[PDB]
Paper text:
Intriguingly, the autophagy adapter p62/SQSTM1/Sequestosome-1 was recently reported to recognize N-degrons, the N-end rule substrates of the well-characterized UPS, and where ultimately these substrates are delivered to ALS8,9. p62 is a key selective autophagy adapter that plays a role in the degradation of various cellular constituents such as misfolded proteins and their aggregates, malfunctioning organelles, and invading pathogens. Intriguingly, it was recently reported that the central ZZ-domain in p62 plays a critical role in the recognition of N-terminal arginylated BiP/GRP78 by the Arg-tRNA transferase ATE1. Here, we present the high resolution structures of the ZZ-domain of p62 in complex with 8 different N-degrons including type-1 and type-2, and subsequently identify key determinants involved in the unusual recognition.
Therefore, we determined the structure of the ZZ-domain in complex with a variety of N-degrons comprising three type-1 N-degrons and five type-2 N-degrons. As described for the R-BiP complex, two aspartic acid residues, Asp129 and Asp149, bind to the α-amino group, and Asp147 forms a hydrogen bond with the first peptide bond, which means that these interactions are conserved in all different N-terminal residues. However, the side chain of the N-terminal residue of the N-degron is recognized differently. The side chain of Asn132 which undergoes a conformational change plays a critical role in interacting with the first residue of the N-degron. The bipolar nature of the side chain atoms (O and N) of Asn132 allow for the recognition of positively charged type-1 substrates as well as type-2 substrates, and especially N-terminal tyrosine and tryptophan residues since they possess polar atoms in the side chain. The binding affinity between the ZZ-domain and other type-1 substrates with histidine or lysine residues at the primary position showed ca. a 10-fold reduction, although it was still significant.
Author numbering: -3 to 45
The structure:
Amino acid sequence: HEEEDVICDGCNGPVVGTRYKCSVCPDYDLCSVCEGKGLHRGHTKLAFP
Ligand SMILES: [Zn+2]
Ligand SMILES: [Zn+2]
């Protein structure tokens, strides 16, 4: 079966918990740590659980 998963573009790891997906770029996501460290911070992101 094809499983769906969100890999953080900052630490190449999985996105567990809050997903911060960029509203500008296509297909860009950050985990809470990379988001909290200011990666990709000038683009608006959708923070959903
Ligand atoms: Zn990360
Ligand atoms: Zn972006």
